[PDB]
Design a binder for this molecule. Structure first.
Ligand code: CDL
Ligand code: CDL
Ligand code: PLX
Ligand code: PLX
Ligand code: PLX
Ligand code: PEE
Ligand code: PEE
Ligand code: ADP
Lengths: 107, 56, 40, 347, 459, 98, 320, 54, 42
């Protein structure tokens, strides 16, 4: 059996390279220190500073397009009106029955 | 340096330009949906003396 | 540490005359590299 | 052969197809079919080897039997009504004879057996011609007489063709046989919408021709006829393999690729006619075609197969001959889904 | 809506015209800016919707998903920067192109006023994910995984298309607004039962449903980190969004047809939580946890009550964020140990204390610790189920207990105990990994301050 | 449709079946196509003569010519196949398979 | 007008270019011999074009700039290592043999292209025919395995079945003792180690198989060391004989058009040199293949097509 | 983990589909290339087609 | 190989593009004018 046991021509599996070895203060972004530092800076500025803080403040101060206070004020004046006139607060019918035409059964 | 970093940073301007173009296209598409402007029963409003359209 | 890529044994699955070899079709042979058969 | 003779034979094949397409007399349609068959054989036998001769003789036997059946249908139709114009047949028996003749000419199941063998025997350019240009005349005749066809028989043959193509492609390592089974499945898709809308038939035909042209030209460029030969292309032309993978994805019917346009439309059309079960089965069966397209993509571009040492020499040379329409074919076969309503042009 | 779509498209020429060593920086910066711009969709109305045009519309169900989709891309780029170092510029540009195309398809899918357009984009998302899995995955099983992730999906999605066109042949339209306003009851018929099944099964397979979940562990385990992040965070939510949209035409047939799926989900959450207790792989455990959470979301959508829908929306957002964080932590361990076996690298608290804190907070959010939005969705769904039937409380509480058990088991196995002696290549955590972890976790604890942003249209 | 037409039709059917049998001897296959065309010629001539349709008196001859041309090609093919094997047996044409 | 079907249609015919002087000829000789000198002398005397014997980097001389590339990018084999350690574990012997056969195929294609396009004949050293003798030697000495010889036979059949063999072959006969004496007189340290058994086996192959098989389809001129010194007699022998037994007289204008299309487009010439047969000596894994292909692409004039390389100095790129 | 997830759920949907498609593909694509059998099937199909429809 | 930018091909390509664009602009102009005249707009 003169076979080589080498099934094919293959490069050996390379060993993983440490970014801290050639460069302490390596930030884990790139092996080029300048590109590494600027990648860290842009990620931190546009992620933590711009989006995370300014966007959160923008969401906090969004105008009331859901009309929560509007509904509260409408309910307040409506309850004030019905309590003053003795009306039974909320009605059980959502629509007026006079304007609904039921089908006569005659069963 | 001008005329040198432009050849290396020209790509950066593209995303911002797209945002402006998209805003313009959104407004242009808005201009084609005015069939009911100042005609809804909820917001039938009489125009101000120096007004052309209620909204743009 | 390295992404797996097909070896020779993986490639030889696709080297037969047909896929999914059977007892009847085992004796089949792949065609010649150029579509020429010896005139015998 | 001589380039003059080759050009003459190609124009004779095209003139036969044209004769079939422009005539209103059944005799002239039969003559166009005869002319096409007569000029097609040397094209299949352009490169001489025993396999090409076998493919040509099988193709001739099939097409001549189909022509005799078609002439029998014509004569029976004349017997029951002295008419020569291609229109509604007026005879139940004649229509069946005509339908079987055209199914044999197209390669629809159960008359599919000749397509894989003929495609494997002939070269890649001959296969391109056989799978693209040789479907126009029978499909045009079918479109002209679509109001006559029995929907049961046409739909049975369409579903059988889809099933047979899907199952037969799963077992192939040869690229030409894969193309043949794909063509059988696509013919099955095309003929299932003839009873309802011939415009959808023509749209499917155009999309299929575009994709088949792109795939054959890519296979000719990277001169491979087997899976393992195609697995070597990434080590010389990776961009060709990427384009081939995208084209294969399109041929499997994935959105938003162009190959999704026909089936979708066809399904949509078949739903307007209260046909629900049949399109469902057709799509489920097309999943098989997608499976073997995906296997080819895995073997070609999504993984890197081992190469050989002599490939290094091939790194030093570039193609002398180029296809001008290959980029256009790729783009038209991958990125025309947004232009779907243009099908109103009655393509 | 074009003010978000056009910049995402411009991400492609910018990526392909970039320097060889500026692709990550430019992609990250402009994706973050696109996320910031998309953040202004959160200003929703109490009335109908944000109907931008005939093609695209926004809703308070769509807006949180859109914002999460836009926020996920920068994190995916940061996670992918490490393991793509030794690869050519063209291939890295192709990888970033696949991510950008996935984001574009997801963005157009979530707005998608048309149901056929929604289907087309919802199936177009399939291609980039498949290419990412089967091209940049490590093990030999990835190809097989891809096949599963493909065919399952299509096996569910092909009938839906037929159903969809059928509806437009009868109703005359597939616009969601017209469908909602012109909706009519479904009679109890065999044809209507099969229409219901064709409408539901496509979204059920991608949640995934318990019986139909086989593709998920394979696809998530064999995918690269960006692929796993996008699969767990956004792609699983397509089924929930589609069900929430499509259940408007399925009433009142949902009352009868929901029972087998309700039983499957209620038992499968227990089954998958129990499976998590015996798992030798971190990624598989996280995948099964995702299956359990999505089973709870399926129950919520099937009950179809207001509290159910609010809980399901909150849980979808919270699960996306938490699962992305967990996958990132697992990948940080893997890139050091190269094994992905949970029992191998032990006692990592003594060597990586800040990463241990990140692990703890991720496990806490997965455990649904109040007042996190995870527990907000959990509790809303549980209360809705209790109103649906008081006996669901046993299964829900058992699921909670097992969830806490396997989350703390995962934390204790990897972080506590004694370090493995023979492993000496555990390097200090990079600033990139810590920044990634914070960018996952701060949005969760900051969303717990404003829950109405992620509670959906029925708030 | 009288008995002569049905006799010619069944002759065509017999020729077609004989072609579809393929016992051996591809020459026999060519002969079966040939009998098919002969039956076609006979029945078309009978139909055209009976109805006194003067112009289609052309088409039988034309049919013959075209079919005859086809026959020539087939013979060539047969000959060439024999040149590879020494016989025109059908079973030798199994190099190409499904 | 690059040659194609249209040129053939309009005017381009090569039967008129043949002026009974073309006579594609090849020279065969033992390792270290006068065949090179004799081939050159025949080339100047007969007015033919001489083709120096193909080496590892013959293909490098015809593409890009003629300067050879690195061993890792061109050949991945060396003759010196084969001489030093012919029984290597990494399979250098058969890789060398296969690369040399592919180089000889490319050189034969170039020679045929020149002869058919110009009408001027060519002179060659060891061609694709008689390249097998070394293979046989390597098998009889045990330098390579058998599966190597089946693979070589397959490639040689599929490739050489499409070209015209040379009109007349010139063989210089040299005994082994004198061949070894000349090897020692050269002073090359690596050629010092060629065992006499290898030379004798190589010699046996030419006489036993190569001579009779070329005698029945071509014309053979057996010469010795003394009679190979005077090229006048050799040229006279070439002139006197007339080639009428080979396939060349049976060739015509359309077959010449087909052959001229084949000899151009070197990718189709080398098409079957990389058939997917996985022999460990020649098959290369995906990682090494990708790395070496990336290295080859980064070469100065190799990223794009020859006219589209800026670093070399091609101008007007944006208008080509 | 094993009985249901790794065995029976695999056996039911994916493995069954793969097995059935495998067997059907083997049955469909296994023709020896003899045109005698092909045209015998052609006669059969043609005969069946004429009779069933009418 | 070693070839100059073929100014004949370049000129023909530019000429074809310019001719097509000019033809398209003209065709659009008479299309608009014909539509306006037929529909009685202006
Ligand atoms: C309680 C009041 C707090 C008020 C002070 C303000 C605190 C603000 C914190 C904001 C969130 C923290 C950010 C997360 C990442 C941590 C950063 C880090 O690495 O630390 C480095 C830094 C430097 O340490 P080092 O030596 O360099 O690192 C060594 C190792 O890392 C080893 O480090 P370690 O061993 O010290 O561990 C780090 C620490 C920090 O890591 C964490 O685990 C923090 C995350 C825990 C939450 C997990 C998710 C569950 C959902 C809760 C959502 C609450 C958010 C509310 C809104 C927040 C707005 C963004 O973990 C813990 O100590 C475990 C604490 C377990 C707390 C569980 C109880 C939760 C509910 C409590 C009540 C909330 C609602 C109240 C409602 C009624 C009252 C109004 O350490 C710290 O500064 C510690 C952080 C502060 C401790 C947080 C504990 C309570 C805060 C809860 C959130 C805010 C409450 C709002 C109510 C105010 C009234
Ligand atoms: C919609 C339906 C679309 C149907 C699908 C399209 C069918 C395409 C096939 C057409 C025939 C074969 C072919 O053109 O090859 C395809 C070709 C691939 O070339 P190839 O397979 O490498 O060609 C090898 C030749 O057969 C090797 O032959 P060669 O080296 O002897 O060629 C010499 C050359 C040069 O011929 C000459 O020298 C001309 C001489 C003029 C003499 C005039 C005498 C008149 C009597 O003649 C030709 O190449 C064929 C000329 C055909 C002229 C027909 C009019 O690529 C395409 O043509 C794709 C066309 C795009 C799709 C169709 C058009 C758009 C729709
Ligand atoms: C996949 C892309 C396919 C593209 C197709 C090839 C593109 C190049 C074609 C070159 C120009 C073609 C125009 C032909 C000039 C004159 C046309 C005239 O002769 O034909 C008319 C009609 O021409 C064609 O119908 C129009 C062809 C246009 C095809 C485009 C539609 C494809 C579907 C949308 C896919 C997106 C493609 C667009 C991107 C390029 C009248 O036909 P008619 O004699 O009365 O009836 C025959 C047809 N019937 C029987 C069905 C009724
Ligand atoms: C290190 C040790 C600690 C040091 C630091 C000590 C200080 C701690 C104080 C901070 C935490 C304590 C909690 C106290 C909260 C105070 C602020 C809070 O009250 O404001 C909230 C306001 O904040 C927002 O509601 C929440 C922020 C929204 C988060 C958006 C996420 C950012 C985008 C990132 C991408 C998205 C990824 C996830 C996709 C879904 C709620 O206010 P609200 O009563 O309601 O109305 C706002 C004011 N109005 C009345 C005028 C309207
Ligand atoms: C595998 C992993 C999970 C995948 C997804 C699983 C979910 C699919 C479950 C399907 C939902 C229910 C299907 C049918 C529900 C109808 C109600 C039925 O179950 O009850 C009886 C139905 O009776 C019987 O079921 C009749 C059908 C019997 C045949 C069914 C086969 C039984 C087992 C098949 C299960 C296999 C599922 C997977 C297939 C590949 C009531 O009879 P009746 O009141 O009179 O008629 C009611 C229907 N009407 C009103 C429209 C007329
Ligand atoms: C009626 C026809 C219906 C058609 C439905 C098609 C569904 C798509 C799957 C088809 C699979 C066909 C291929 C096959 O099974 O071959 C066995 C094949 C052999 O491996 P090869 O890749 O061929 O060789 C490589 C090593 N030498 O086995 C596999 O690889 C299987 C891997 C993919 C499994 C995917 C399973 C997806 C199905 C999930 C359930 C739903 C199925 C679809 C129908 C739903 C029910 C209505
Ligand atoms: C993960 C893999 C799952 C695979 C798919 C699962 C979903 C299966 C759902 C059914 C598929 C096709 C349904 C049709 C699509 C809707 C169209 C429709 O509703 O129209 C019906 C048509 O209804 C049908 O035709 C249904 C026929 C179904 C045939 C295919 C059966 C597939 C398997 C059946 C058993 C399993 C069913 C549920 C499986 C769930 C997935 C496990 C009524 O229309 P008409 O008939 O025109 O009007 C009535 C008057 N004539
Ligand atoms: N097919 C081959 N196999 C092995 N070695 C070869 C082959 N072809 C040429 N060579 C080597 O090329 C070298 C030079 O060839 P040769 O003519 O004998 O010497 P020189 O160039 O001085 O005349 C020799 O050492 C020979 O071994």
């Amino acid at each position: 059996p003169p076979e080589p046991t080498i099934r094919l021509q293959e490069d050996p599996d390379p060993e993983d390279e440490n970014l801290y070895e050639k460069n302490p203060d390596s930030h884990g972004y790139d092996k080029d220190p300048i590109v590494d530092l600027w990648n860290m800076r842009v990620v931190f500025f546009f992620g933590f500073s711009i989006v995370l803080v300014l966007g959160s403040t923008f969401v906090a101060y969004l105008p009331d397009y859901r009309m929560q206070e509007w509904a509260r004020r409408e309910a307040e004046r409506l309850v004030k009106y019905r309590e003053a006139n003795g009306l039974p607060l909320m009605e059980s019918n959502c629509f007026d029955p006079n304007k609904i035409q039921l089908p006569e059964d005659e069963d | 340096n001008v005329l040198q970093i432009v050849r290396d940073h020209w790509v950066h301007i593209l995303v911002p330009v797209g945002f402006v173009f998209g805003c313009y296209l959104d407004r242009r598409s808005d201009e084609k949906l005015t069939a009911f402007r100042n005609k809804s029963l909820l917001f039938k409003r009489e125009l101000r003396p120096n007004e052309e359209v209620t909204w743009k | 540490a390295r992404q797996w890529q097909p070896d020779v044994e993986w490639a030889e699955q696709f080297g037969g005359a047909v896929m999914y070899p059977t007892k009847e079709t085992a004796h089949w042979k792949p065609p010649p590299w150029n579509d020429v058969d010896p005139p015998k | 052969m001589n380039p003059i003779i080759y050009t003459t034979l190609i124009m004779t094949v095209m003139s036969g197809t044209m004769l079939v397409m422009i005539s209103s007399h059944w005799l002239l349609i039969w003559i166009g079919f005869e002319m096409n068959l007569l000029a097609m054989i040397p094209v299949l036998m352009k490169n001489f080897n025993p396999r090409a001769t076998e493919a040509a003789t099988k193709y001739f036997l099939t097409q001549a039997t189909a022509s005799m059946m078609l002439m029998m249908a014509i004569i029976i139709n004349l017997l029951y009504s002295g008419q020569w114009t291609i229109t509604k047949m007026f005879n139940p028996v004649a229509m069946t004879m005509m339908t079987m003749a055209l199914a044999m000419k197209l390669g629809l199941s159960p008359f599919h057996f000749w397509v894989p063998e003929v495609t494997q025997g002939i070269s890649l350019q001959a296969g391109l011609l056989l799978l693209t240009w040789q479907k126009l005349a029978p499909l045009s005749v079918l479109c002209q007489i679509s109001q006559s066809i029995n929907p049961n028989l046409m739909l049975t043959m369409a579903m059988l063709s889809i099933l047979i193509g899907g199952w037969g492609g799963l077992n192939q390592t040869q690229l030409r046989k894969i193309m043949a089974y794909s063509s059988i499945a696509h013919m099955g898709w095309m003929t299932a919408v003839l009873p309802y809308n011939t415009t959808m038939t023509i749209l499917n035909l155009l999309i299929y021709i575009t994709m088949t042209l792109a795939m054959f030209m890519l296979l000719i460029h990277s001169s491979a006829t087997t899976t393992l030969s195609l697995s070597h292309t990434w080590n010389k032309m990776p961009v060709i393999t990427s384009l081939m993978m995208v084209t294969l994805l399109s041929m499997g019917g994935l959105p938003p690729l162009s190959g999704f346009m026909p089936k979708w439309m066809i399904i949509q059309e078949m739903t307007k006619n209260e046909s629900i079960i049949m399109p469902t089965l057709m799509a489920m069966t097309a999943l098989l075609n997608l499976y073997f397209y995906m296997r080819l993509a895995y073997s070609s571009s999504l993984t890197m197969f081992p190469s050989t040492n002599n490939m290094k020499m091939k790194w030093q040379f570039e193609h002398t001959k180029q296809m001008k329409l290959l980029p256009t074919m790729i783009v038209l076969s991958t990125l025309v889904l947004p232009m779907t309503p243009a099908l109103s042009s009655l393509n | 809506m074009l003010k978000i779509i056009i910049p995402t498209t411009m991400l492609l020429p910018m990526t392909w015209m970039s320097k060889h060593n500026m692709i990550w920086i430019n992609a990250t910066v402009h994706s973050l800016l696109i996320s910031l711009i998309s953040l202004s969709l959160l200003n929703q109305l109490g009335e109908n919707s944000l109907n931008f045009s005939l093609t695209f519309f926004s809703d308070s169900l769509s807006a949180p998903l859109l914002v999460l989709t836009t926020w996920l891309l920068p994190l995916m780029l940061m996670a992918s920067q490490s393991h793509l170092s030794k690869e050519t510029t063209t291939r890295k540009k192709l990888y970033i192109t696949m991510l950008i195309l996935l984001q574009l398809f997801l963005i157009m899918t979530f707005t998608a006023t048309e149901l056929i357009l929604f289907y087309i984009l919802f199936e177009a998302t399939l291609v980039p994910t498949l290419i990412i899995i089967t091209r940049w995955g490590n093990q030999t099983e990835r190809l097989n995984a891809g096949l599963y992730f493909l065919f399952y999906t299509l096996a569910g999605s092909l009938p839906l298309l037929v159903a969809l066109v059928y509806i437009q042949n009868t109703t005359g339209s597939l616009n969601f607004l017209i469908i909602h306003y012109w909706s009519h009851p479904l009679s109890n018929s065999w044809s209507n039962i099969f229409m219901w099944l064709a409408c539901i099964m496509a979204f059920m397979v991608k949640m995934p449903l318990y019986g139909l979940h086989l593709w998920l562990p394979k696809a998530h385990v064999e995918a690269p980190i960006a692929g796993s992040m996008v699969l767990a965070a956004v792609l699983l939510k397509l089924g929930g969004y589609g069900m929430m949209r499509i259940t408007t035409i399925l009433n009142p047939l949902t009352n009868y047809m929901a029972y087998p799926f309700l039983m499957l989900s209620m038992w499968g959450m227990i089954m998958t939580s129990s499976i998590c207790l015996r798992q030798t792989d971190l990624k598989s455990l996280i995948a099964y946890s995702s299956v359990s959470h999505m089973a709870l979301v399926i129950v919520a959508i099937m009950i179809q009550t207001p509290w159910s829908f609010m809980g399901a929306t909150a849980l979808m957002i919270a699960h996306g964020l938490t699962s992305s964080m967990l996958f990132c932590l697992a990948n940080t361990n893997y890139e050091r140990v190269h094994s992905r076996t949970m029992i191998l690298a032990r006692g990592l608290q003594t060597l990586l204390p800040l990463m241990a804190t990140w692990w703890l907070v991720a496990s806490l959010t997965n455990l649904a610790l109040p007042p996190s939005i995870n527990l907000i969705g959990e509790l809303f769904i549980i209360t809705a189920s209790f109103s649906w039937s008081n006996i669901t409380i046993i299964l829900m509480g058992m699921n909670m207990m097992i969830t806490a058990l396997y989350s703390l088991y995962m934390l204790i196995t990897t972080q506590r105990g004694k370090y493995t002696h023979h492993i000496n290549n555990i390097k200090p955590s990079f600033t990139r990994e810590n920044a990634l972890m914070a960018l996952h976790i701060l949005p969760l604890l900051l969303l717990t301050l404003n829950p109405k942003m992620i509670l959906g249209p029925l708030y | 449709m009288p008995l002569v037409y049905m006799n010619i039709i069944m002759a065509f059917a017999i020729a077609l079946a004989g072609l579809l049998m393929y016992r051996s001897h591809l020459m026999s296959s060519l002969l079966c196509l040939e009998g098919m065309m002969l039956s076609l010629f006979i029945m078309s001539t009978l139909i055209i003569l009976n109805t006194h349709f003067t112009l289609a008196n052309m088409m039988p001859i034309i049919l013959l010519v075209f079919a005859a041309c086809e026959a020539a090609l087939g013979l060539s093919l047969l000959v060439m196949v024999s040149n590879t094997y020494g016989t025109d047996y059908v079973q030798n044409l199994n190099l190409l398979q499904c | 007008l690059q040659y194609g079907p249209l040129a053939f249609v309009l005017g381009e015919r090569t039967t008129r270019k043949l002026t009974e002087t073309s006579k594609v000829i090849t020279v065969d000789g033992n390792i270290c011999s006068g065949k090179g000198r004799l081939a050159r002398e025949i080339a100047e005397k007969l007015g033919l074009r001489h083709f120096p014997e193909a080496g590892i980097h013959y293909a490098d001389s015809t593409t890009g700039d003629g300067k050879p590339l690195d061993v890792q990018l061109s050949g991945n084999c060396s003759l010196e290592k084969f001489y030093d350690d012919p029984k290597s574990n990494d399979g250098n012997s058969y890789r060398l043999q296969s690369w040399l056969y592919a180089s000889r195929l490319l050189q034969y294609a170039d020679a045929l292209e020149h002869l058919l396009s110009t009408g001027q004949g060519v002179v060659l050293e060891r061609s694709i025919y008689s390249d097998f003798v070394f293979l046989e030697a390597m098998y009889r000495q045990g330098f390579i395995r058998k599966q190597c010889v089946e693979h070589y036979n397959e490639v040689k059949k599929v490739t050489a079945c499409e070209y015209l063999p040379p009109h007349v072959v010139v063989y210089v006969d040299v005994p082994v003792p004198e061949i070894q004496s000349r090897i020692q007189k050269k002073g090359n340290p690596h050629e010092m180690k060629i065992t006499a058994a290898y030379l004798q086996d190589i010699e046996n192959a030419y006489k036993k198989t190569f001579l009779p098989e070329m005698s029945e389809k071509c014309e053979v001129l057996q010469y010795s060391a003394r009679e190979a010194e005077d090229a006048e007699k050799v040229v006279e022998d070439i002139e006197y004989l007339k080639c009428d037994k080979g396939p060349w007289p049976d060739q015509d204008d359309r077959t010449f058009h087909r052959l001229r299309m084949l000899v151009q487009n070197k990718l189709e010439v080398l098409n079957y040199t990389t058939i997917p047969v996985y022999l460990p000596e020649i098959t290369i894994g995906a990682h090494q293949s990708d790395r070496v292909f990336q290295k080859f692409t980064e070469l100065p004039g190799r990223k794009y097509s020859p006219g589209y390389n800026e670093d070399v100095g091609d101008k007007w790129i944006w208008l080509k | 983990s094993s009985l249901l997830d790794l065995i029976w759920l695999e056996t039911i949907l994916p493995k069954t589909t793969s097995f059935i498609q495998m067997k059907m593909s083997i049955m469909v694509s296994n023709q020896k290339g003899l045109i005698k059998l092909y045209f015998l099937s052609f006669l059969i199909t043609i005969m069946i087609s004429m009779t069933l429809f009418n | 190989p070693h070839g100059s930018p073929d100014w004949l091909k370049v000129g023909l390509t530019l000429g074809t593009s310019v001719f097509l664009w000019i033809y398209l602009i003209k065709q659009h102009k008479e299309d608009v004018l014909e539509y306006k005249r037929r529909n009685g707009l202006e």
